[PDB]
Amino acid sequence: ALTCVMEGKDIEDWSCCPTPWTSFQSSCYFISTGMQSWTKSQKNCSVMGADLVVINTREEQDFIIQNLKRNSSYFLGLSDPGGRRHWQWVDQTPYNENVTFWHSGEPNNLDERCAIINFRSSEEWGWNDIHCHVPQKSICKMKKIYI
Numbered sequence: 470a471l472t473c474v475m476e477g478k479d480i481e482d483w484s485c486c487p488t489p490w491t492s493f494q495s496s497c498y499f500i501s502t503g504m505q506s507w508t509k510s511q512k513n514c515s516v517m518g519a520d521l522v523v524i525n526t527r528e529e530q531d532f533i534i535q536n537l538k539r540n541s542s543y544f545l546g547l548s549d550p551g552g553r554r555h556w557q558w559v560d561q562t563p564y565n566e567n568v569t570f571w572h573s574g575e576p577n578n579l580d581e582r583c584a585i586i587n588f589r590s591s592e593e594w595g596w597n598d599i600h601c602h603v604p605q606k607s608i609c610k611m612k613k614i615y616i
């Protein structure tokens with residue numbers, strides 16, 4: 470089943486997500502609470518027709534964090550596979566340093582080549598580079614369906 474809501478006041482503009490997903494602007498988001506490596510997480514998002522989350526704006530991040538638990542860490546679709554700080558998003562969209570939300574002092578390791586979002590005291594939610602093989606929860610994102 471799909472969950473559909475109206476965009477603006479236009480009674481014909483209904484956009485939808487599968488029911489276990491949440492919606493914000495033109496995208497659907499799914500929180501995957503199983504612990505898996507970054508690559509297995511991206512594969513899992515791919516199976517449900519999506520990708521690991523790509524964060525475009527502060528507004529988007531502020532929405533996503535409403536659906537996360539402050540004691541948990543979640544993979545983003547953000548990685549540096551060659552260890553050169555040449556960050557990649559999984560949907561081949563640009564990496565814009567001035568719209569990133571790294572915690573203070575992050576990213577801090579060339580050998581930590583995947584990114585997570587989590588909560589740190591006082592700094593609240595932000596990003597950390599970590600080892601890709603360490604199992605974590607993840608966030609998947611895809612476009613809404615219009616009917």
Ligand SMILES: CO[C@H]1O[C@H](CO)[C@@H](O)[C@H](O)[C@@H]1O
Nearest residue numbers: 575577578581597598599600
């Ligand atoms: C707890 O946070 C610290 O350790 C992790 C790895 O566990 C690093 O990614 C992070 O930058 C800090 O140095």
Ligand SMILES: [Ca+2]
Nearest residue numbers: 577597598599
């Ligand atoms: Ca780090």
